[PDB]
Structure formats: C-alpha cells, structure tokens
Amino acid sequence: PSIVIASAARTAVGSFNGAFANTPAHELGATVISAVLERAGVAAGEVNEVILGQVLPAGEGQNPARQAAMKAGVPQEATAWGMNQLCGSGLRAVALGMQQIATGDASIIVAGGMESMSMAPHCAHLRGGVKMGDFKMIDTMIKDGLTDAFYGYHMGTTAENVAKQWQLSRDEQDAFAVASQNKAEAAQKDGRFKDEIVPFIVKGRKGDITVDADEYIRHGATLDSMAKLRPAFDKEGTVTAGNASGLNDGAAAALLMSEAEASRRGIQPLGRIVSWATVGVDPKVMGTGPIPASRKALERAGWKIGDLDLVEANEAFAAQACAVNKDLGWDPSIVNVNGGAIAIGHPIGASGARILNTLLFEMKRRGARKGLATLCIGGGMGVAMCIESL
Amino acid sequence: PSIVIASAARTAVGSFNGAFANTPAHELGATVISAVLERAGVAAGEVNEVILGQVLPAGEGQNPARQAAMKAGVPQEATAWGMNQLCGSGLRAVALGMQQIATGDASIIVAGGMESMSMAPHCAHLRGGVKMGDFKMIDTMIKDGLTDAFYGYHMGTTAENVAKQWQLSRDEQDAFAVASQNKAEAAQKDGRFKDEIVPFIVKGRKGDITVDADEYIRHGATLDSMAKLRPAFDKEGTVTAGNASGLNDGAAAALLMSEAEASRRGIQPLGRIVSWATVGVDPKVMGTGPIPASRKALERAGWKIGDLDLVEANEAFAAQACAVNKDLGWDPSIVNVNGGAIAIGHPIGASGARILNTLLFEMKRRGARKGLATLCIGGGMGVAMCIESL
Amino acid sequence: PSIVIASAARTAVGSFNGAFANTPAHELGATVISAVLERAGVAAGEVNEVILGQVLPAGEGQNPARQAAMKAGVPQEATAWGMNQLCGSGLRAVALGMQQIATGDASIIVAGGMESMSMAPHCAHLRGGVKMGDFKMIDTMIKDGLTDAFYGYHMGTTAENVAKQWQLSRDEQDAFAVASQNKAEAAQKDGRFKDEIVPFIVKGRKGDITVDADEYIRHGATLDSMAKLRPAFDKEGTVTAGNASGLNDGAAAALLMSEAEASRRGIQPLGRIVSWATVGVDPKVMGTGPIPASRKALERAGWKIGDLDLVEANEAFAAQACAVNKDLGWDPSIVNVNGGAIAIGHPIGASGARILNTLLFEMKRRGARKGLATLCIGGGMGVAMCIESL
Amino acid sequence: PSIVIASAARTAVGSFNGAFANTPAHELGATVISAVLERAGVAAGEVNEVILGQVLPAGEGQNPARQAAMKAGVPQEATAWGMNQLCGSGLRAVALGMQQIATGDASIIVAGGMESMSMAPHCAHLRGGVKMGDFKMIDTMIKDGLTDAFYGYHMGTTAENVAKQWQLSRDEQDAFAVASQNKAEAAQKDGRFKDEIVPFIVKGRKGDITVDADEYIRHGATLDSMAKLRPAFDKEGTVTAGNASGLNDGAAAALLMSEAEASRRGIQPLGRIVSWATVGVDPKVMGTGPIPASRKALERAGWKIGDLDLVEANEAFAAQACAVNKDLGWDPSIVNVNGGAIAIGHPIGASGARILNTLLFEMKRRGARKGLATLCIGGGMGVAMCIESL
Ligand SMILES: CC(C)(COP(=O)(O)OP(=O)(O)OC[C@H]1O[C@@H](n2cnc3c(N)ncnc32)[C@H](O)[C@@H]1OP(=O)(O)O)[C@@H](O)C(=O)NCCC(=O)NCCS
Numbered sequence A, B, C, D: 001p002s003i004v005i006a007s008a009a010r011t012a013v014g015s016f017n018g019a020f021a022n023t024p025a026h027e028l029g030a031t032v033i034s035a036v037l038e039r040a041g042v043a044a045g046e047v048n049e050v051i052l053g054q055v056l057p058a059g060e061g062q063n064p065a066r067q068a069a070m071k072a073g074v075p076q077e078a079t080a081w082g083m084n085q086l087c088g089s090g091l092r093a094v095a096l097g098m099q100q101i102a103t104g105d106a107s108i109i110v111a112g113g114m115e116s117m118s119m120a121p122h123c124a125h126l127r128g129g130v131k132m133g134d135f136k137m138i139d140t141m142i143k144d145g146l147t148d149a150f151y152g153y154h155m156g157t158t159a160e161n162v163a164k165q166w167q168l169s170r171d172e173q174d175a176f177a178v179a180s181q182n183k184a185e186a187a188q189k190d191g192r193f194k195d196e197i198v199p200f201i202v203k204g205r206k207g208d209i210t211v212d213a214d215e216y217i218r219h220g221a222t223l224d225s226m227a228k229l230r231p232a233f234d235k236e237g238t239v240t241a242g243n244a245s246g247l248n249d250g251a252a253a254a255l256l257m258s259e260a261e262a263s264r265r266g267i268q269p270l271g272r273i274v275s276w277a278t279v280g281v282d283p284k285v286m287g288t289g290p291i292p293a294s295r296k297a298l299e300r301a302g303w304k305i306g307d308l309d310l311v312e313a314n315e316a317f318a319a320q321a322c323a324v325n326k327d328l329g330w331d332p333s334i335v336n337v338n339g340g341a342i343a344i345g346h347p348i349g350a351s352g353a354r355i356l357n358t359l360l361f362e363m364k365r366r367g368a369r370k371g372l373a374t375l376c377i378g379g380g381m382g383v384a385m386c387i388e389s390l
C-alpha cells in the first residue's frame, strides 16, 4: 500500500499565555482540520476518522479529538480519537492514520496533534479527603507533560545528562540556539511559513484577532543575551531557558489517502510516506531518541543518511539537537533550514505534525525529493518518518 | 496477515473508592502486562510496544502506558503509548495493536486498557488568576469521562434519549439490570472469572491485600431494590443508579502476535482477530453505537449475525443494551452470559479489554467458535471486534 | 477612670492587589505599633497588650496580632489578641483597650485594626473529601468579609435596601461620592494626611518602595464617570463601584494609657475617650447601625448632637452614609471633612482605627473640642465613640 | 462591681472528624448559648452581647459569633463578636464579658468560645494567578491553630522544649496521661459531666443523632499501651499522640451578670469572678504560660496557692501540665479531678470555656469554695481566672 499526504496545515505557534491563552486545543484543531480539507479539495463529509495527538486534555471534556472533528463539520458517522506518545504524538498520529488506510479500514484520515499548554489546569486528587495537613495543587502541564515519571526530574535534566555524555559546551548550545532564532526570523520575514500556516481567529469581546504568525520567534536574538542566562535545571549546568524550547500552544495536521485515491481526485500530494519508526532509549537521555528512530526509519525506507535532501529534527533542547546531529552525521545545512522549536516553540502534542508541516512545505518549495522528520520523546523514545516527493 | 490473541488477563474490577481507591492505573496495568506475558510464555524482553487505553490520566505523570510497561520489566528499547476513544478505548487499543503487526512494524504487542476513576483528580485552569470570587474545581472523571461535550449533559441523559426512542419501560430496564447481577453472581460463584482474573496485590503499611474478585457485583440483587430507586438523570425518567453501570477501576490486556509467530512458539491462542470496526452515531443516542459497529464488523468478517456463538455487548446502561439487543436480533441467551457491566462495573478505558477478556475465556471454556465484542462510546461512536477460535 | 489616646498612626490605605498586594496584615500592623510607640516616646517593653481587629486572618499563622506585636519590638512578656466585629473591629478594639486600663488590668495598650484583603485566600473544606462532582473554592474575602450570613447576599445589597426605605435617588448617591472624592483629593494634596500616615517599606527584590500615599483616592473625579457606571448588585439598582467603598489593605492604631499617666510621661494626648457604644439593628439594613450606635455613645457622654464639632462617619456605601446624615441631623460640613471611605478605602478590620486616626489628627489640626467616630457593621450592628481633645 | 457566673454549659467534645465532623462551630455555639439562657432562667431578649473565642473561622461567613447568637434566638438588637487568643480565647472571652459589665456597658453577657477543627478548610492565595508550577493548599487548622508563627514548628515541639528544661522523662509523661484518661473515664461513667454537658442534635438525612457524651475519652487506658507509641514531633523525643491532647470540636459558655442582678432574679450563680490574668513568655516554651498567669491571678485575688480547693489547668501536653504542677506546688489530687484535655480533647477557641465549665460544676458538687482555671497559649502566653463560690 502507498499512502500520501494530500495536504497539510498548522496554526501559528502561540507563546505561553500569549495569543492562544484562552483558546481550547480542539478549537485550534478544528481550524487545522478545515484547512487540510480546503487545501486538498476534500469535503468534510468524506473524512472517515480524525486522529489527534494530545498530551494535556484535562478539563477539556470528552475526547477533544471528536470535539475538533465535529466543530470542523466532520459528520457524526465518522470517528475520532486522541492519543499520547508525548512529544512524538502529532507525528505518531500520522503513522497511525497511514496504518488505517494500509489495512483497509479507512480511505480518508485527518491526523496530527493539538495542544494548549496555556489552558492545562492545576489538579489534586480529593476523593479520599485530606484529613489533615497541606497538599499540592499540581500543574498538569509540568507533571504530565514535562517531568520524567521514573526519575522525577524535568526534561531539562535529561538534556543536562546528554550535554555531559556528549561534552557539549554552554558556548556550543548557545550558538545553536541563536542560529535557530536567526534562521526562523529569516524564514518568517521571507514568508516561508505562510504556506503552512492557516490563520486562526481568536474571538473575544471587543474584537476578533487574527493570528497568523509564530509569535515565540525572537527577532534580533543576540549571543550576548543567550550567554547571560542562568542555568535553568542544574546550578553548574549548561541548559537554560534560552537554549531550550518553550511552553506553547498550537495544532497541526495532515490529510491522508492512498496514492491511487489522490490520483483519482487529481490531487498533487505533498509527499508519499515511505517509512516510519519508533524506538525506546534510556529515559535519562531521552533526547537521544531520534538517533535509533531515524536509523530504523531510514533502514525501512532503504535509504542511506546521505540520500536525505532535507531534515526536520525537533529541538527540544540545543544539547540534544546537537547530540543527534553529531551521531547521525547528516549535513547540518539541510537540517531545520527554517529554524526549529527553540525559536518556533513546542506545543507538545502538536509538535510532531508541526515539524512535519514545515518539512513538507519546504520540500515542495525547494524541490527536495527525500526528507525525514524526527522527535525525541519523554520517558525515552524517538519517532521518525521518511517522506518522498512525487 | 492473520493476528492472534495469544493470551489475555484482567484485574478484578474495583468499586468506586473501593479496593483500588489509592492505586494508580499504571500499577493495575503493570500487573496485567506481567500476566499476559506469563500466560503466553513470552518474556518481557520480547515485547515491541505497549498500547493502553486510558481516559483519565490527569495527574498520573508522563505517559502512564510507559510507566506500566517499565514497571512490568518491558525494556527501555520498546515503546508505549496511550489512547482515548472513551469507552471504546481498551478494545480499540487491541485493534491498533493488531495493525502494528499487520503492517510489519512490530512482532509482539501488549494492548488493552487501564483506568482509575477513583484516583481521577479535580482541576481548575488558574494561570490567568482569580482576582475575586468563587471558582469551580471540576471533577475530571465527570468532565472528561461522563459528560457529553456537545449537549453538556451526562451519558445518562443519552440513555434516557434511547429509552424514549425505543419505548423501553422502567420495568424492562430493571429486569435487565437484575439479570445482569444474577448472571454475574452465578459466574462469580462458579469460578468463571478465575481464569481471566490476575490477582492484584494492594500494598499497605499495615498489611498487603490480595484483590481477586470483582467487588461491584451485588449478590442477591432483588427486583424490588431496583424498583425502589429514583431516576438519576431525569425526574420523569427511567434510568437509575441501579440500571446503569458504575464508576470503577481496573485494567485489562491482550498479548498479540501473528498466527505464524504463535505456531513457532507452540502457543495455543485464545482467538484469531477476524475483523474490527468503528462507526459514529448521533451523540444524543450514543448508546446505539454498537448497532452500526457490530454490523460493519460482521460484514468485514463475512459473517451473519446468526453465525455468532457468543457476544459481549457492553452494558453502559440497561436502556442502551436493550436497544442494541432488539435491533441486532441476536439470541439474548448468548449475550453477556456471565453478566455485564451493570454488575461488574465500568472502568472506562479498560472496559473494552475487560469484555474482550470475558469473551475469550468463555469462548475457550464452552468451545464457542465465533464471538463478537462491542461497546458504545460517548460522543456517538461504537467499536466492535470479531474473534474466531483456532 | 479616664483613658486618653496618647498617640496614633496608620498606614496609607492601598487599593486591592495594589501597594500591599503581597504584604501580610501583621507586617502593616507592626509598622503601626512601632509608629505609635515612637510618636508618644514610649518604649515597646512598657506595652502590656496589643489588641488588633482583623476579619480575614486565614493562612496567616497563629494569632497574627501577636505577630504584629513581636515584629514591632513588643517583648515576649506582653500579650496580644485579635478580635472580629467586622467593620467596627478596629474601633471596638480601642474601646476594649480603654477597658483593660479602666479595670486595672493594664497600664498601656496598643489597639487598632489591620487587614490584608489582597492576601485573603480561597479555601474549601476538604477533610471529608469530595467523593464525586464539582465543588467551589470560596473567596474568603467575600464569604467571611462581605456576604451576609443570614440572607446570603453582598453588603451593597443591604445598601440597596436602605436606598429603598430612605428613598435615595441614584443622582443623590453620586453627589455624595464625588464630594468625598473631591474632599480627599483636597486633603491629600493639601498635606492633611501626612501626620497620621506612617510610611511603610514594601521590601521588593529589585527595589524597596516607600508607600506613604492613600492610593485608592481618584484624582479629578466628576459626576460623569460616576453616572456612566452600571449598578453592581441589582440590575434596576442604584448602588455602584463608585458610590460604594473599595477592597483595600492597611493598618491603624492608637496608644492608650490613663490620663494621669500621660501627664507623668510628659505626653500631650490626641484625645480622651469619654464614651463608646455598640448596638444591633436588622441585618437587612445593616447601614442603619451608626444611627442607634451614635445616639447611645452620645448619651453615655452626656452630650448632644449639636455639641459635635467633628465627626467621622464611615462610608461603606453612599446610600448608608447619606442615611445616617439625614436621620441624626448633624451638619454635614463637619462630616468627613478630609473625605471618606468611598475615596480612601475600606480596609475592614482596620477601618474603625483608620477613621479614628483621621478624626484625631484633624481635630488636633483645627481645634475641635469634641469628636465622634462611628461605623456600620455587617450582620446589623453599629459602633461609636466620643472624643474630647485636651 | 462584683460579677458572677449565673450559669454555664458546654457541648460534648467531639473527636476529629467524629460526631461533629460536619457541624459548623456557630451551630455548637448556638446550642450552648440557648443552654446558659435556659439554665439561668434568663430570656434571650435580655442579652446585651455574645462574645465567643474562635481560632479557625475561615469560610464560615460573616462573624460566626453573630451567627451563633441569631440562631440561639438572641434578638437583632444585641451585639456579637469573636476573639482570638488561641487556646486562651474561651476563658479570655469570659474575662472580656466581665469587663463589659464592670464598665457599665452591659448588664448581661454570654461569653465563651467555639471551634470546629474538623470543618476548618484548606486555603491558598490565588489572586495573581499561578502561571506555572505546583502550589500549596494550606490546612488552616495546622497553619493557624497549631504552628508557631515565629519558629515555624508544631506546638508539640514547644512541648519537647519544655520537657527538656524540666527533665520530664517519657515514663513520667505517660503516667500523667494514663491517670488523666482514667480520671475522665471515672467522671464519665459516674455522670460527673452530665450537669455541664448540654446534648447536641446532629441533624441528618437518614436520622437525628443526639450527642451528650465526650467521645474522645479512651476507656481502659493503660500505661503499657501509652508506652508503645512513637514520638510524634522529635524522633528521639518523648511527646506522643498518647500524652498530648488531640484535635477536637466543641463549644462552651457562661452567662455573666452582676451579683446584685442575680439576687434580684433569684439565681444561684456558679461562681463570682474574683480575678483574671494574662501574661507572655517565650513561644519556644509556651507551655509554661500558666505559671505566671496563675501566680499573677492569685496575687490579684489576694489568695495563696494553698487556699485553692480546686484547679483546672489545661493539659495541651503532659510535658507542660507536669511542669506547671511542679512549679506551683498545688496538690495534684485537686488538679483536673475529672481528667484533662489529653482525655477530653482540645477544641481550641472553646478549650478555656470548656475547662471553666468543668471546674464550676465540680466546685458546686463537692462544695469547693475557691477555684482557678488556667491554660497555656501558643505564641507564648498564659491565661488564668480565680473563682469563689457564693
Ligand atoms: C525553561 C522554562 C522553565 C522557562 O520558562 P519561562 O518561565 O516561560 O521563561 P522565563 O520568562 O522565566 O525566562 C527567563 C528569561 O529568559 C529569557 N529568554 C528566553 N529565551 C531567550 C533568548 N533567546 N535570549 C534572551 N533571553 C531569553 C526571557 O526573556 C526571560 O527574561 P526575564 O526573566 O528578564 O523577563 C520553560 O520554557 C520550559 O519548561 N522549557 C522546556 C520545555 C520542555 O521541556 N519541553 C519538552 C521537552 S522534551
């Protein structure tokens, strides 16, 4: 079976408590489902299932993926579900959507992810009561998204572990971070995020605001400001707020169908999904997940690293992005050519389809034939997907 | 590709704030993962992926499926993820496990579900702040588990909608509820849940407690006690706490591999997965989901309704179970022969795998050749799976 | 036994979440305690007891009055206690101080009120647990400070009740609220609050900040911004944000001792306490209570209403404040000459000391032989006290 | 002047989350207010003011003393307020009431205290919002009731400090504790608490329960079970749950009037208040407070210690109780003859009116002439009162 990505879209990525501060993830997801449909010339009546990665759905109500689908006019007879493989989610959803089509269970899938880190609630288990003494209201964003479940420390600490093992200086991490900002700024000013972004209308009271630019990108980002930051996780460390990605909101998706179906419809697809892989690694160095996952995906495609024309490798932290690049040895000039998540941001459950969006539109723009998208995953995993142009 | 269920297990289903009141879902999952492995003679080192349905993960930390896998000794090099299609989740995870094998991405999967409704927290979005006045702490079990996201009302009200469309008296619903209790009691007393149940040790300061019986089942349940209850959702209604399922905790899973892989290993499998389906319906009558799902599953198998030897159709509410039975027209004497959820309970994300467990072990013990498991799903969906013995 | 207020001091009154947003009451209380000691030339070790009114103590630790006293340098030998007569609490504390001395139980007392409405938390009783469903986190500032415990409604609704019985038009309340603004803007600029205020140092991190101005007074207040406000409590109402007092922070106190003592210490006092009283009235019309309270205080003094040259009468609302003026019949050109609580603020537990400070320093200023300070109290009470300058 | 206690009553003392687990303090207070009215044969319309000690009022609404008063049928024309001197409050309100009569401000007062430690909430300051992170829900029972504001540790730590100074072995403390339990079992079983207890009806959904017995008293308390307990604060220390009082709920009151009034009305009072005293000490050793307070009270009464026929001295902890006794040298056999707070419980704001009740009725039944009630006070204070039978 040959599955293509007929169309794709993403919202702009919102800053923490920024543009999307009070927008539920399923509203972002609904806009992105409408857009992939419009972009492909496929009607919502035609969709069989919607599959959305999402890590932080607490308080949002029954299966936000169904909410997003219904809001986008996807008929009640279709189905929808959410899934959670942490930062891998929005990419793994695409692979799962491909499998629906490959096994003959569906013809048309919309797959990606959505996340509102801003709207994630604080919680406490209160059923058994608290007979005496203080208790914590727990931030679900930190607890369920950002804290290792085995070791009890933030993802930032796994990044420090990688910095130590790979001997990555503060200087090198900072330079990588400044480069991410500067590349993202240039791509933004040149209009290279236009094709991928679908504008999102934030409704208010005193006026609707259209959001169509990635607001987390820092323009004119200096090495000096990066260098002046204090280590954010270890007092004698190297990982800072500047060389780590952010807390962000957004959604991203792809519309999938068979290659034979896109041909019937006269759709020029954004690419054929040639392989995907997911592999585990030690939780303590979770940032290394893209290494075995990329290698396995490439093996499954029958491709050498040198065959790749473009790469999107998620920048959760400069320390891990640098480790991945060192080990794989791919030309860094083809990696995150338009910036990465240090600059763009990291809306967890949407990230994987966010970078897939960026890869597919840049692949189209430059005429690149073979690309790969890859993410590290909390708790020690990687996910990778190989895309070829038709 | 022919995928078999090599082994299966579930915990006892705990009562709300009962035996598992302070046991995290992933601990229940870890025991069920260890058990399917032990029962199949497969080592944890051999597992490629763990896929666990779970609707209420809030506060449990990063990717509870990975937590369960790790605690069960599944290697760091395997992967694990969570998914949510509400009541359908634990069955859908099984079909998703099947698909990983079918597409050559994995050889051995443990799939199912887990849920701790008891441990589900209360929450409030507090990031903007609360400058002045009262705010609501929201019960995530109700909000995210049991309330329709479109109409704002409980799943119970959708049961009333179905009661009214199908003209299902209070007396009919209560008789069905009493029967489910009395069937479950008889199965329990005769030992028919022993094979499917893996005991769970609840670790305690003042002593360990082994839980190996379904504690929600009411022994000696009378019609009069059903008849005395007030409607729980509408005041001229008919759906009560007695003729609905409960709020419950448990986990349930299946170990999957190819039919050829089971042969090599000398495993006598519990069943071959012959087909599965998921379809949507109107959220207002979500309890009718099993009707289209089961019919589509049967069509994919090439079976008639009359070919089934055993059926597990989930009893979210008497009202909907009755409607499903009436429309399908299957012999009621082959449906839920050991009782159903009204008696056994309804640990949401686990339910689909719990009923699968019950199906497979009853199929083995009676020598039934063809079986079907189906559930209704909040927000208007159904899932069904057809199993043949080999 | 004749008792005299040897000295007095008060913080400026802050607005809600403003100057004292993160400053505990007891710290504001300590500044005041020290201020009065210094002002009279009395050593802290000479004080027998600190009596501080305070309505909103939750979270602040054991006996915040004791905390005030110790942080002010009052040694461990002295005693301290808080009390609560809601709005009259800070005047009643002065009466109680007076009482200790005239019973021979003490020689020297510091008495006033303190309040941090800003630091008042949300709370819920959670020892029993909350087995299922949403619950409310309660704003203690509102539940314990501004909600009638009998009927269940806010104090501005008792102001609506007094507006209907005393036939006060919406235009007449705006007239009184601008006139108080004008009068307090006048005072502030004219330097009349300098003496009574003791500066408070809000220890920041990037900067300490000397608060010495009443920052709830609105400069250049007209009838227009007043008469374009929506009724805050009824929909067809006449009470508003601008003709009611504010939510505020602050502390206030007096240094008490016997007449003969003050003469021994070479202290020229601010005034002698000749009488005081508290009376109850209907909780529905709680703003009525300064009428019977002021008559009783006045009769205990052996005075007449026309004998008064200066009067502080607390403006919780402009309907209740206009009502006391109209019934008692005193000349309103001697009533709150430096403005009122609508302008200055309503720091509950401190209010009565506050208005005591203004009366005492203003009396001292102009040469007024006889004072009266009086306050209405939620729950249907009044408090009053008659002062003679020596 | 000469004030007498015309009558007195108290509820039973409830166990933490026991009989009064869901009964508000003012409800207990209301029942004790109605009791002292009834027992004195004085009508509620005659009461000038109600003064109740209360330490943990968060979330009970406006001034819970006015709530106990209005529910007791005290008319709206009276006044009511609460006060807080921690464990002293309940006895201190009595001296406060006596002061109101001595200074001609009232003829008739009801005074004592109330407390529901069970119903004390958890709280957090949430006004600015919590942008990121866990935050604490603070148990006001512990924060505001049981934790020293200066040193930040429990009252039972102050009890360790006292035990160290006085060289009071683990055995000595337990011997005092078991005696106190055994004294109270005896008083309970012989009906010595019947007079002072007024029954309280807990209104409920499935039945009214009448509570008229102290439920905290341990029957059959032995030295050997006392000895089996672990230290509750210091891990090489001596203060245990067995030799410290507990967390309890209750209310207690006395009705005060001049000796001449009581003669007018033919009332036989329960005692003439002869003196009272409060003093401060080091908070580190707050349990020594009763020493200067009782010695100063006795100096004010003109009495020697050996003139006392009966003493109630509060047992917040066996360590401080033993210390107090050793210093004062009074015959232990007249101290807490019906047992003490270790047995009976320690409902904070009510403790002092509680032991005042206990002393009064025992003074009446054995024909004792002279009596003293004293308590230690967190933050380092003592309070005492001398009582002569008429
Ligand atoms: C690191 C983290 C705690 C910082 O979050 P934050 O509180 O919203 O950021 P802060 O406002 O505190 O940042 C501190 C400073 O760094 C600055 N900063 C960030 N990037 C910068 C850059 N490129 N140059 C200069 N300054 C920068 C901010 O402007 C801020 O300045 P200020 O405190 O003087 O106002 C948070 O973003 C985080 O958790 N990141 C990791 C996300 C993650 O783990 N994702 C998944 C991992 S697999």
Ligand SMILES: CC(C)(COP(=O)(O)OP(=O)(O)OC[C@H]1O[C@@H](n2cnc3c(N)ncnc32)[C@H](O)[C@@H]1OP(=O)(O)O)[C@@H](O)C(=O)NCCC(=O)NCCS
Binding pocket: B016, B087, B146, B155, B156, B218, B225, B226, B229, B232, B240, B241, B242, B243, B244, B245, B246, B247, B316, B346, B378
């Ligand atoms: C119906 C529901 C709201 C009731 O809430 P609940 O608090 O758990 O109700 P309880 O189990 O305590 O039952 C109430 C009373 O009836 C009794 N009772 C419960 N089940 C009974 C039965 N089957 N027969 C007779 N009596 C019964 C209990 O003993 C209890 O006693 P009480 O009179 O002293 O209160 C809740 O169970 C529910 O939501 N059920 C459906 C869950 C659901 O929707 N799942 C997924 C939907 S697709």
